[PDB]
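Input for the complex:
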Amino acid sequence: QVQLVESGGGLVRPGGSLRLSCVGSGFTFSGYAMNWYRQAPGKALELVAGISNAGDLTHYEEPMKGRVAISRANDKNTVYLQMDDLKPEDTAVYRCHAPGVRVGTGERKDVWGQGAQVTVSSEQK
Amino acid sequence: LCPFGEVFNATRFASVYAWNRKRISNCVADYSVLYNSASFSTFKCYGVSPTKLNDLCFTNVYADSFVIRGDEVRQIAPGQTGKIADYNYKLPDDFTGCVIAWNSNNLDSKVGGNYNYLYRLFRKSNLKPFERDISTEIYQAGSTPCNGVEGFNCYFPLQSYGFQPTNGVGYQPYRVVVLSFEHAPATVCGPKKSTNLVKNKC
Ligand SMILES: *[C@@H]1O[C@H](CO)[C@@H](O)[C@H](O)[C@H]1NC(C)=O
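Predicted:
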């Protein structure tokens, strides 16, 4: 089945590092581009990073432009997101995305991940 | 002077499903810049007259803005049908305001595709007038429940706009602005009707 099962994330302290991973199955993973979105509690899904089919093409948006790095392993059918120098504002649900994958399902051609919770909270008083 | 430049000449616009709303109040509304502009593809008003906006005064002006396809600009009107004006951005039947839009293919299109702009094409109910849904819960198309898991007759409600370099203006990105106008002190006024509020250092 056309699926994207994302893994990693969790809880870290401000300045901490984390790597998310998105495994793809039921379609040629190397044939479609991969995008990383994030949804902060109350705000709408915003684009973090985008990568090409199997090329060295990486596009980052203003949100995290500097402390994030996108990359993919088409041999392992996976795409990663190396997040460093994380801030409390980064606390959100990060989602992978492959546009125009599905075929014979109408305008619904995109395939979306489930979601990985990332919480950047400081220590307790 | 009213801050129309902040909303019209913004760097990056929001998605149709997550439409940004500005509150224009206590300022001079210069509609001249909007009139004398050959860039504006669509400029239609409802319950008012475009040619005579400087001859009017309202107590509030909600300037909603977002990006959609050119073929979806016709849906941005009172009592319409289709994914946009039903799941994304619906207006009331007795709407009072204007719908502005211009072909923004020069700054919202990208060689690989602009995946900042999305739209909701699945919803159990119809979006109420000026209602906003930014939620990303798995939609139930079938009889059986989803249980927040994507599968058969159970999929993600949002869908990305291509906005790849094309020649068809119908399938090109358009920046839409809906200037919804509103027995209270009329705050936003013309350049003549201005109740000595032009020197408020807006
Ligand atoms: C910016 O200013 C106004 C928007 O209120 C309008 O004339 C046009 O969209 C822009 N004009 C220029 C010269 O950038």
